[PDB]
């Protein structure tokens with residue numbers, strides 16, 4: 001009341017007090033500058049075919065209009081007007097002014113990440129060797145090109161990941177994407193499936209355009225089974241456009257002037273229908289895999305999901321881990337959350353051991369008819 | 381003569397085109413890059429040997 | 434325990450300490466490297482880096498070994514002792530400045546500097562007077578220390594053409610005098626009023642003397658000293674700017690909106706520097722009810738006013754509305770205001786953090802702007818002690834001689 005009425009009086013006193021400046025002072029924040037931008041130029045952009053000899057004498061296809069032979073203006077450099085270069089050309093006299101970056105196909109612009117999702121390395125504990133190897137590949141050359149040069153090696157420019165579903169692949173990728181420091185570029189595997197023939201090829205072209213422009217970047221591939229796994233050939237002509245997309249992914253990855261400062265991470269759920277051209281190292285070098293957390297892994301993942309929740313700390317966690325022999329971290333998360341939900345049945349602020357036992361026999365033994373991994377452990 | 385060919389050739393935008401055929405009643409037929417077919421009775425500053433459709 | 438629980442790497446020494454060269458940006462980088470504090474490594478990184486350095490930056494680098502180590506009392510003497518009494522005036526004067534930086538309870542560094550101070554016009558020990566009167570202002574806050582102020586009587590009576598003599602006189606005796614018993618109008622600051630109005634020259638004097646005046650006015654609860662200095666002082670807008678400085682400092686903040694509508698009217702004054710400090714009082718006044726602190730100062734046009742709001746965000750934790758104001762304040766073209774944005778921008782945050790920094794790399798890529806960017810990088814990585822030195826910073830549009838004292842806004846642990 002007193003805070004409310006006094007804050008209303010003070011804030012509206014400042015408001016109605018500046019109202020004197022509002023009704024007394026009589027956009028223009030740029031108006032004179034914008035009218036000095038009226039002697040500027042419309043500057044239509046184009047595409048260059050070739051140059052001529054002894055003179056500039058440049059040749060240009062605009063985009064649709066025609067093709068013209070032009071000359072350069074005086075405020076240009078006679079060097080960086082090379083072929084296949086989107087340059088801004090005068091509308092009246094048809095003269096080249098500024099070279100620019102090329103066409104990027106803007107539906108490919110929206111897969112750079114532009115943010116950082118907050119996932120810390122602490123969330124994948126119990127997978128120490130995998131974290132170690134993937135750290136060794138991804139983090140270390142971008143932050144320390146010291147051991148890799150003074151000993152004279154090349155780090156493995158590609159790492160694939162696999163395992164059963166829900167094992168931490170996506171989560172490890174996001175953990176890298178927190179501490180990446182590079183131009184991390186997401187690619188869903190279904191992004192390369194378009195209506196028209198050979199269009200996903202051009203998407204891969206533009207991906208590696210962006211990759212070669214910006215040095216020291218990361219590209220993440222995700223569920224590469226849609227991108228293409230096998231070249232089953234019959235008298236039907238079936239899955240073929242996907243196959244050409246996969247081949248164009250092969251060649252512009254690694255071979256005949258290799259890739260540069262780019263690292264590719266792939267992640268699949270079923271690494272078994274893959275053409276062994278991808279299985280050739282030099283493209284996909286380290287086969288890092290995620291098995292199930294055996295015994296102590298689930299203790300540690302209980303420590304992960306349990307460290308910031310309202311429980312009774314007098315209980316143990318090892319007995320909880322001993323009842324989950326073939327289980328993923330997702331099922332662990334469901335156990336923790338569902339034990340909380342059983343605590344919401346009553347009105348308590350701390351869990352009990354019986355709540356977690358209800359959670360175990362609620363998740364595992366009940367929904368074990370679905371359970372997602374009796375037919376992916378065999379990697380069908 | 382150089383004054384006139386300065387007044388023509390200093391027009392630096394050259395619309396490029398394609399010679400469609402070559403009449404002789406020494407007469408060349410042009411389709412420009414805007415796809416407009418043009419006739420001309422007078423060829424200009426190129427030789428009929430160097431031309432082909 | 435700072436060394437123990439934290440583990441800070443080396444690629445910002447090398448990378449952020451690699452940001453090129455030019456004896457300014459490089460000089461600033463020394464400062465940036467220096468305020469790194471995982472050991473006092475950038476302190477003991479060899480030689481030939483301070484030999485590239487020049488006079489007031491040599492003050493900044495001689496004090497920078499003070500800045501790396503605001504502890505290690507026994508180590509302070511044995512690290513600064515090489516740079517004590519050296520061949521260079523700026524090495525020795527910035528060295529005693531560093532001795533004033535590192536601690537506040539030693540008081541045995543006084544006498545090697547204290548003894549030398551007198552020069553009677555403009556010799557060496559007046560620059561040791563700048564670092565040592567200032568660093569001794571860093572050193573002690575007594576009931577009223579009077580012996581150091583009896584030393585300060587031949588300082589203002591000395592009155593070197595170097596600004597920061599009277600600068601650290603007013604600021605240092607103010608650091609002695611902040612928290613006075615409802616202030617005082619005593620013969621110390623009364624003497625610097627009369628000896629201030631003695632010489633009307635180099636208006637930075639007419640700005641930084643009302644600094645220490647208003648610092649002695651701090652400690653007020655009910656002080657009529659604005660009326661007393663209003664009777665003694667006011668004149669042509671140098672001393673009416675002194676009037677607005679006492680008007681700023683005497684009015685820390687309460688429910689007292691009558692001076693906020695006074696702020697509304699005299700905010701429209703045609704002299705546009707009493708606008709600067711008088712509107713700059715806002716972050717002192719309404720610092721607790723900070724939801725009203727967003728104002729339309731950016732919607733105004735007296736570009737120093739956009740500077741004032743740019744101050745008024747400052748350094749606390751800095752919510753999304755503040756960084757949203759740094760959306761527009763980040764993009765401006767004048768080099769003192771584009772210089773003015775990364776300082777409080779990276780004070781208010783002590784990718785995310787480095788995202789506006791690389792955005793400033795997108796802004797420029799002048800030399801000032803590069804320096805501003807370096808300052809922002811340094812920032813990236815009612816207690817009166819944090820209230821004084823940025824109002825000491827508020828005359829930044831000036832020489833690097835002024836920026837030789839820029840590293841005396843010691844407000845962080």
Ligand SMILES: Nc1ncnc2c1ncn2[C@@H]1O[C@H](COP(=O)(O)OP(=O)(O)OP(O)(O)=S)[C@@H](O)[C@H]1O
Pocket residue numbers: 123124125126127164165166167168169170171172268269293301304328329330333
């Ligand atoms: N080893 C683990 N430790 C801790 N949490 C885990 C672990 N594995 C999975 N989780 C949690 O369960 C979620 C599911 O893992 P994800 O990697 O997202 O699954 P996935 O990679 O999408 O598997 P798919 O379906 O084959 S793509 C993670 O985001 C974590 O929240």
